[PDB]
C-alpha cells in the first residue's frame, strides 16, 4: 500500500512463504528452520503428525 | 509530425524542425534545455548518409559543400528516421 | 497529432484529478507530455523522492494506468542498471478506467439495494446486528422488546434504511460529475484505438532533459519468447 | 395524423427487412392503435382541406408532411397487387443503420387500366419493343394487329456485333460482384482505346450502372 | 510459446527459457492464474 | 400448505420396552413424538395416514446401547410453508412490534415496518391493539398475511409476513 | 501568488508533508482538482480491478 | 432526458440493460431499475419533482410510441373505445349518425386527451359503461 522497490516485496513474500512453510513443516532439505527463544526448533504440524508420539 | 522529432547531436539533445515555407528551406536544431539554437542552411548540401535496419545504431551524417560541414544526427525511433 | 490521442490524454488527466492526489496528477501528466520515462528522468524532471514515488508507482500500477518495461541496454560506461522505462498502454488504461468506475457505480447500486431493506434491531452490549427475519424468535412472553440471547438488554433501532435518499443523493452527485467520461468513452467506442507499446510510444516521445542516462533505442535479444 | 407517423416511426425500428401486404399493415395498425381503413382512404383530401382553409403563407414544412398523406392514401385504398418492403439499410455500406420504408407497385397495369378503358383506340409504338407479346401480358390488355417491320436496306446501314472474349482470348462480363477484375479492366481498356482510335467523329458509351461506371473509369485513370 | 525448464529453488520455483538461457523467478500469482486458466478435462486427466 | 407426504423416522426404542406386544408400543412412541412436531425438512408434520399397515422394518441394535433402532416408514399430513404462499389467519397476540397471526400450526409474525403507514399500535385501549382509519387489527380477527419468508431449524419453523399487498387484510 | 492560482485549478503545486510551501511549479493542463468528493475518492481506492485477460 | 433515466442517473453506456417503462396515469420516463427500487415495497408518489400521484407498480408498462402525448392519446383511446364498440351494423346502416357517433367519441377522448372538460365527460363515460 504504501509503496516499496521490488527487491523489498520479493523479500516480503519470500519471508511470508518460509512462514508459512515452517508453520507447515519445519523440516526442510536445504532449508533453515524456525527457532525458539530457547534455542530449540519450532515444533512444526509435521513434527507434530510424524514420528512416534504423533496423533496417528 | 514528419517534419518534427527528438534527436540527438554531438552527444546534446534536441528537436529537429523544418523550417520548409520560408525559403530556402532549413533544418533547426533546437535545445531541449534551451542552450544552443542552430540552424542549418539546405542551400550547402552534398550529401546525406543513412543507416539500414539491419544496423543497432542508428545515425545520420550530412555532408555539406565548399573543408567540409559534417553534421551528425541520432534519432530514436525507425519510423520518425 | 490525433485527436482521439489528445481525448485519452484529457481521460487520464481527469481521472487522474478526480480520484487521486496531486502527485499523481504530476507523474501522470509527467508520462502524457514525455510519452518514454525512466526512474531518473521522473527524478530528474520532477525532483521526486524514491519513496515518495514508490506509493505512487505502486498505485499507478495496481490500477493499470502507467506501464513499466523491464529492458536494459548496454551505455558505452557498460554500467547496465535496471531501468525502468514508465510510458502508457492506452487502450488497457481506458479498460482500466472503464472497469473502475462501471464496479464503483455497481458497487454503489450494491449498496443502495442493501439499504433498501428495513431498518432492522442492534445490540450496542454486544455490538450484534440483527435482521428483521432473525430477530422474529427473541421475543419475549411480554411482547413489549427485543430481548437479546446473549445479553438479554433491550434492543435499539438501527439508524439503516433511512439513509436511502442519502445513498440516492450519492448516487447524482457521482453520475453527473463523471458525465465527462461518459461523454468521451461515447466518442471513444465510436472510435478505433490502436494497440500502441513501448515501440510505439518511442514514435512519440519528447525529451525530459539534455542527457539521459537511459537510452531509448530498443536491443533485440536472441531467445525471448515472453 | 400525428399517430400514424409516430405508428410509422415504431414501424422504422427493426433489424431484418419486413416483407407485407397492405392488409397485414392495416390489420397490424388497427390492432396496435385504433386507426380504421376509411379515413386513411380520405387523409390525404382532408389535409388538403385544412392547409387551405388555414391560408398558412409558407408550407415547406408542411411539404413532406405530404409524403405521409399519399402513404396514407396509397396502402389503404389499395389491397392486392401492391407491397410494402421495410428495410433495416437503405445502403448497405453505410455503417450507421438508415431505415427506409418502400409502399411498391407490383402491378403494372394498375396504373395504365383506366387509359386501356377510357380510350378506345391506343398505339403502342416503341423503336425497340421485343418481344412484343410481353407486353399484352404484363399489361393487362388485349391487341388487335400485332406487327414489327424489317427494315429494307440496299446496304447494310447498321452493323451490330457482339464481342464475348477480349484481345487474349479472355471471357468479358459486367456482372457487379465481378467489377474489381484486373482482367476485364485490361480488355475493356484496350477495346475502347482501339475503337476510339478507329472511330471517326463520336462515341456514346453505355454502362450497366453508375457505380460500375465510377470503379471502371477510376480503374482506367490509375 | 517454447516452454521454459522450471527448477526449485529452496521454497520458490525458477525458470530458465532457451536460448536461441534467461532465468527468472516464477511469481506465485502467476502459477495461480494459470491454474486459474486450466480446464475441467486437463486436471481431470490429471486426476484432480 | 398442507401436504401429503411418505417420511421415515428413526426410532430408538427402549430395551424396557421389549414385550410380546411391542409393536403398539413402538406404534406409541412413534405417534407420540410426531403429532404436532415441527421438522424443518417437513414442516409440521400433524396427523398420520394409513394407520392399519404402516412399513416397520427390522429394528437395529445399537453397538453400544442395546436399544433397538427401528426404520418406521409412515404416510403423513404436514404443513410446510413457503415464501410467496398468501394464508388466511387469525390474530392470536398483538404488540408494537407487530402481531402474530396463526395459521394452521404456525405463529406468522408480521412486523411493524411490513403493514402500510395508516395502521397505528395503541396500548390504551383493551386489548392493545392496531388501528387505522378504515380497519382495526384485534385479538382473534379475520385476515389474509403473505408469506415474505420463512426460516426452519431442526425443530422449529418461524415465518415473517405481511399486509402490504392489496386485496389482503381482514375479509 | 502560487496559492491563489494553485485554488483557481491554473498551476499544479509541489509542496512539502512537514508544511505547505510552494517549491515546484506546473501548468495545469487538466481541469479541476477538486472536482471529486472525498467520500468518493475512497470510494474508488476501495475497489480493485481484474487481471489483463478477464477484461 | 430521453438517453438517461432522471431517477437513477444511469446512462446508456453505462448500463445498456435498463428498458423504457412509463406509469400510464402520469407519465414520467423511467427505468425498470427504479420500477424495481421504490415500488417493490409498496404503492408510493412519483419520485420526480413537482409530481406526487399515486401510482402502482403492476400497472407499468413500456410505450410504444416513444412519444408521451401519443401514447396518452392511444391509451386513452383503448380505455375509451373498450365500451364504445359500435360499429355502422350497429346504426343500420346509417352513416350519418355514425359518422355524428365517431365525432362524438373524438370529442370525448380530446377532451379527456387535454383535461379542459374531464369532469362531466368522465362521467359520461361512467354512465355509458355502467349500461
Ligand atoms: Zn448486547
Ligand atoms: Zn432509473
Ligand atoms: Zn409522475
Keep these: 500500500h504504501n509503496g516499496a522497490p521490488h527487491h523489498a516485496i520479493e523479500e516480503a513474500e519470500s519471508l511470508l512463504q518460509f512462514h508459512v512453510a515452517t508453520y507447515m513443516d519445519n523440516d526442510i532439505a536445504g532449508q533453515p528452520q524456525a527457532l525458539q527463544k530457547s534455542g530449540r526448533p519450532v515444533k512444526s504440524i509435521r513434527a507434530r503428525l510424524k514420528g512416534k508420539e504423533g496423533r496417528i | 509530425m514528419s517534419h518534427s522529432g527528438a534527436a540527438i547531436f554531438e552527444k546534446v539533445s534536441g528537436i529537429i524542425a523544418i523550417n520548409e515555407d520560408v525559403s530556402p528551406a532549413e533544418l533547426t536544431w533546437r535545445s531541449t534545455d534551451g542552450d544552443k539554437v542552430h540552424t542549418v542552411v539546405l542551400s550547402t548540401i552534398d550529401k546525406l548518409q543513412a543507416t539500414p535496419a539491419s544496423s543497432e545504431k542508428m545515425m545520420l551524417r550530412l555532408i555539406g559543400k565548399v573543408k567540409p560541414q559534417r553534421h551528425m544526427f541520432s534519432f530514436n525511433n525507425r519510423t520518425v528516421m | 497529432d490525433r485527436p482521439i490521442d489528445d481525448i485519452v490524454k484529457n481521460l487520464l488527466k481527469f481521472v487522474v484529478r478526480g480520484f487521486y492526489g496531486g502527485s499523481f496528477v504530476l507523474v501522470l501528466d509527467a508520462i502524457l507530455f514525455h510519452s518514454v520515462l525512466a526512474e531518473d528522468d521522473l527524478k530528474q524532471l520532477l525532483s521526486i523522492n524514491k519513496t515518495e514515488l514508490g506509493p505512487l508507482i505502486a498505485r499507478l500500477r495496481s490500477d493499470r494506468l502507467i506501464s513499466i518495461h523491464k529492458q536494459r541496454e548496454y551505455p558505452p560506461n557498460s554500467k547496465s542498471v535496471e531501468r525502468v522505462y514508465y510510458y502508457v498502454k492506452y487502450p488497457h488504461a481506458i479498460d482500466a478506467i472503464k472497469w473502475k468506475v462501471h464496479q464503483v457505480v455497481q458497487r454503489l447500486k450494491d449498496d443502495l439495494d442493501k439499504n433498501s431493506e428495513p431498518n432492522g434491531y442492534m445490540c450496542p452490549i454486544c455490538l450484534t446486528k440483527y435482521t428483521q427475519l432473525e430477530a422474529v424468535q427473541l421475543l419475549n412472553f411480554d411482547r413489549t422488546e427485543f430481548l437479546c440471547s446473549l445479553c438479554d438488554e433491550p434492543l435499539v433501532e438501527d439508524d439503516s434504511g433511512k439513509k436511502n435518499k442519502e445513498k440516492q443523493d450519492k448516487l447524482n452527485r457521482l453520475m453527473d460529475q463523471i458525465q465527462p467520461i461518459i461523454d468521451s468513452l461515447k466518442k471513444i467506442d465510436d472510435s478505433r484505438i490502436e494497440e500502441n507499446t513501448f515501440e510505439i510510444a518511442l514514435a512519440r516521445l519528447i525529451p525530459p532533459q539534455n542527457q539521459s542516462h537511459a537510452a531509448y533505442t530498443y536491443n533485440p535479444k536472441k531467445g525471448s519468447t515472453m | ?222 | 510459446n517454447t516452454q521454459p525448464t522450471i527448477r526449485k529453488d529452496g521454497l520458490k520455483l525458477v525458470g530458465s527459457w532457451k536460448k536461441d538461457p534467461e532465468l527468472r523467478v516464477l511469481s506465485t500469482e502467476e502459477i495461480l492464474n494459470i491454474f486459474k486458466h486450466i480446464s475441467v478435462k486437463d486436471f481431470t486427466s490429471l486426476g484432480f | ?171 | ?55 | ?131
Design chain 8, 1 to 131: 432526458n430521453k438517453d438517461m433515466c432522471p431517477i437513477c442517473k444511469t446512462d446508456r453506456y453505462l448500463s445498456p440493460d435498463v428498458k423504457f417503462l412509463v406509469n400510464p396515469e402520469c407519465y414520467h420516463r423511467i427505468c425498470e431499475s427504479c420500477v424495481d427500487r421504490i415500488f417493490s415495497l409498496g404503492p408510493a408518489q412519483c419520485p420526480y419533482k413537482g409530481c406526487d400521484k399515486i401510482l402502482r407498480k403492476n400497472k407499468f408498462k413500456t410505450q410504444i410510441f416513444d412519444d408521451v402525448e401519443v401514447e396518452k392519446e392511444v391509451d386513452i383511446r383503448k380505455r375509451v373505445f373498450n365500451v364504445f364498440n359500435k360499429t355502422i351494423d350497429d346504426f343500420n346502416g346509417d352513416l350519418v349518425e355514425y359518422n355524428k357517433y365517431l365525432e362524438e367519441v373524438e370529442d370525448i377522448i380530446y377532451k379527456l386527451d387535454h383535461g379542459i372538460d374531464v369532469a362531466k365527460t368522465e362521467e359520461k363515460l361512467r354512465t355509458y359503461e355502467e349500461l
Design chain 4, 1 to 222: 395524423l400525428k399517430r400514424l407517423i409516430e405508428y410509422l416511426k415504431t414501424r422504422m425500428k427493426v433489424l431484418h427487412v419486413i416483407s407485407e401486404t397492405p392488409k397485414s399493415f392495416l390489420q397490424h395498425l388497427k390492432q396496435l392503435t385504433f386507426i380504421e381503413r376509411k379515413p386513411l382512404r380520405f387523409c390525404s383530401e382532408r389535409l388538403s382541406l385544412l392547409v387551405r382553409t388555414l391560408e398558412v403563407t409558407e408550407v415547406e414544412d408542411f411539404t413532406a408532411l405530404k409524403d405521409i398523406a399519399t402513404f396514407a392514401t396509397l396502402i389503404s385504398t389499395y389491397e392486392e397487387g401492391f407491397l410494402l418492403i421495410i428495410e433495416p439499410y437503405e445502403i448497405e455500406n453505410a455503417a450507421v443503420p438508415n431505415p427506409i420504408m418502400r409502399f411498391t407497385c407490383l402491378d403494372a397495369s394498375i396504373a395504365i387500366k383506366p387509359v386501356f378503358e377510357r380510350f378506345s383506340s391506343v398505339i403502342i409504338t416503341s423503336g425497340t419493343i421485343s418481344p412484343l407479346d410481353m407486353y399484352p401480358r404484363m399489361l393487362n390488355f388485349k391487341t388487335v394487329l400485332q406487327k414489327s417491320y424489317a427494315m429494307t436496306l440496299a446496304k447494310k446501314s447498321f452493323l451490330p456485333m457482339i464481342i464475348t472474349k477480349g484481345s487474349d482470348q479472355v471471357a468479358i462480363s459486367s456482372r457487379f460482384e465481378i467489377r474489381n477484375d484486373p482482367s476485364i479492366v485490361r480488355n475493356y481498356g484496350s477495346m475502347l482505346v482501339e475503337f476510339a482510335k478507329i472511330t471517326p467523329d463520336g462515341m456514346v458509351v453505355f454502362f450497366p450502372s453508375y457505380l460500375y461506371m465510377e470503379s471502371i473509369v477510376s480503374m482506367w485513370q490509375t
Design chain 6, 1 to 171: 400448505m398442507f401436504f401429503i407426504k411418505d417420511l421415515s423416522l428413526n426410532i430408538t426404542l427402549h430395551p424396557s420396552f421389549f414385550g410380546p406386544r411391542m409393536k403398539q408400543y413402538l406404534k406409541t412412541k412413534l405417534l407420540e413424538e410426531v403429532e404436532g412436531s415441527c421438522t424443518g425438512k417437513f414442516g409440521y408434520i400433524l396427523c398420520v395416514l394409513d394407520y392399519d399397515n404402516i412399513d416397520i422394518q427390522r429394528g437395529r441394535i445399537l453397538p453400544t446401547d442395546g436399544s433397538a433402532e427401528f426404520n418406521v416408514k409412515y404416510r403423513a399430513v404436514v404443513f410446510k410453508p413457503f415464501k410467496g404462499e398468501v394464508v388466511d389467519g387469525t390474530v392470536v397476540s398483538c404488540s408494537q412490534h407487530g402481531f402474530e397471526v396463526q395459521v394452521g400450526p404456525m405463529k406468522v409474525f408480521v412486523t411493524k415496518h411490513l403493514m402500510p403507514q395508516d395502521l397505528t399500535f395503541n396500548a390504551g385501549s383493551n386489548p392493545p391493539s392496531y388501528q387505522s382509519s378504515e380497519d382495526v387489527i384485534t385479538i382473534k380477527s379475520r385476515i389474509r398475511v403473505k408469506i415474505e419468508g420463512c426460516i426452519s431449524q431442526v425443530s422449529s419453523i418461524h415465518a415473517i409476513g405481511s399486509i402490504k399487498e392489496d386485496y389482503l387484510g381482514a375479509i
Design chain 7, 1 to 55: 501568488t502560487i496559492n491563489q492560482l494553485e485554488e483557481d485549478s491554473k498551476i499544479l503545486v509541489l509542496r512539502t508533508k512537514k508544511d505547505k510551501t510552494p517549491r515546484y511549479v506546473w501548468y495545469n493542463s487538466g481541469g479541476n482538482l477538486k472536482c471529486i468528493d472525498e467520500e468518493f475518492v475512497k470510494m474508488w481506492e476501495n475497489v480493485q480491478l481484474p487481471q489483463f485477460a478477464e477484461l
